[PDB]
Amino acid sequence: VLLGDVNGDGTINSTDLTMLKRSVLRAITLTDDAKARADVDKNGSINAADVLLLSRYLLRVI
């Protein structure tokens, strides 16, 4: 539902970014609900491109 809100706490911030990058490096595992929130470009995969898109959003360029 709320794209970018990886941890599902209702706000999009850099803590979601940490969670996203650690999951992409397989340092953590996401819950299924979190996976839907993590796929920020909605292409069906969670990867480095999602990390970069979320970073751009947090830097407010988009």
Q: 43 touches which of Ca ion, other proteins, none (CB within 5 to 8 A by kind)?
A: Ca ion
Triad 8, 14, 19: Cα angle to 5°: 60
For residues 27 and 48, which CB has a smaller minimum distance to Ca ion in the complex?
48
Among 2, 5, 12, 41, binds other proteins (CB under 8 A): 12
**Binding range to Ca ion, per CB under 5 A, among 2-10, 21-29, 54-62:** 2-10
By CB under 5 A, name the binding residues for Ca ion.
5, 7, 9, 16, 39, 41, 43, 45, 50
